[PDB]
Write a protein that binds this ligand. Structure first.
Ligand code: SAM
Ligand code: SAM
Lengths: 213, 213
């Protein structure tokens, strides 16, 4: 995965910031009540770190559950959008998550629709930084798109193309990372990295994960 | 879709023909009884045409249900393997299905796991020839892989990846066409081309279609 794909994906979200909520993540609206049952399970409490907060759709929920939220995003434009919710207990910080080392620790870490934008060759290092961010007794939780277990094997592709072309309505076009991972695949891969994981398809096409370091 | 992908796909199966039954189609063995409930619904009868017969897994069944089977495959190697079943009422013919205009008509046309190897730019001409091959009162039935209705939109790719990369036993690597199409997508496209279609997911990961001209 070339650095061009990382930058073109960032630039994409930097440019999509104005119009983002006009479209949102496809069918996330269908899946939100199922994901919310997991989000409110009680692990999102105290000092909470959110990764890739975007326009702050999840940040609102976390704000309601946490004492304080630290919300990180690569796009200052996303941050400005998120500011319009006026959430008293949220601090925003701009941060390239592919070049990030936490300095403190938090009770819980959350991200929605971020991991699928992390290519396999960046997976492990992202997850090492996530590890250091988790306070003792803390949890990592995330939401993402998913596949049924067997699709990967039916497809049987030895060089999966991670890239997807997206095009705004102004006409400028971008390639982004889009890696659909099954609950089984993420569990295998994060177990190998030392996490204990409960990863579940909560609604067709969507997963929710709880990971303990 | 370049002619080189088409050729690569056919050479992949030519080379695979001797070891094909050793791996077969992933999870088809799980889905076979469900698919058989449809195959045995009574439309496979009289003179049937089979497209992309391979090693004759389905030809065996077609042979038991029909009077006569004409089985077409691009690979003589595949045809040689299929001959080992010693089916009395079956005639094999080598035929490149992307360069094919039937001269005869049949009571039924069947194919299993062929349509997913027909790229979008070849789909219409393929169905045009299939239309020529169906006798009045006849049907086309087919088995293939499937996706959940919503995946396509969740991915949201404007240049969808038509291709996957396979590796043989001996290490030889080949790109092939692998287009997963939902029942609704297939129904909508085939209806636009004048077919009435009953397309159903009969087992997770697998669909069965009955199409009428
Ligand atoms: C649409 S997805 C996240 C969805 C939305 N932010 C949410 O949490 O529901 C992309 C988000 O990740 C952010 N992002 C993309 N590349 C990044 C990077 N390299 N470093 C940090 N954030 C990045 C984008 O700014 C965008 O907000
Ligand atoms: C994975 S399938 C095998 C079929 C298997 N017997 C079945 O029906 O379940 C692909 C089959 O299509 C054939 N094929 C690939 N390209 C072709 C082409 N251009 N024309 C005719 N047959 C082709 C291959 O020879 C192979 O037998």
């Amino acid at each position: 995965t070339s650095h061009g794909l990382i930058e073109s994906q960032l630039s994409y979200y930097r440019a999509r910031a104005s119009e983002y909520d006009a479209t949102f993540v496809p069918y996330m609206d269908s899946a939100a009540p199922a994901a919310l049952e997991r989000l409110r399970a009680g692990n999102i409490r105290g000092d909470v770190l959110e990764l890739a907060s975007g326009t702050g759709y999840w940040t609102r929920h976390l704000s309601g559950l946490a004492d304080r939220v630290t919300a990180l995003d690569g796009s200052a434009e996303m941050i400005a959008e998120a500011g319009r919710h006026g959430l008293d207990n949220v601090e925003f910080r701009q941060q390239d998550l592919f070049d990030w080392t936490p300095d403190r620790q938090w009770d819980a870490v959350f991200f929605a629709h971020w991991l699928a934008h992390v290519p396999d060759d960046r997976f492990e290092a992202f997850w090492e930084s996530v590890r250091s961010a988790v306070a003792p007794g803390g949890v990592v939780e995330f939401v993402d798109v998913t596949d049924h277990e067997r699709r990967l094997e039916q497809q049987d592709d030895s060089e999966p193309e991670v890239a997807v072309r997206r095009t705004l309505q102004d006409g400028r076009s971008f390639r982004i990372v889009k890696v659909f991972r099954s609950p089984a695949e993420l569990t295998e891969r994060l177990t190998a990295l030392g996490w204990s994981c409960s990863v579940d398809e909560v609604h067709p096409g969507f997963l929710y994960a709880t990971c303990r370091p």
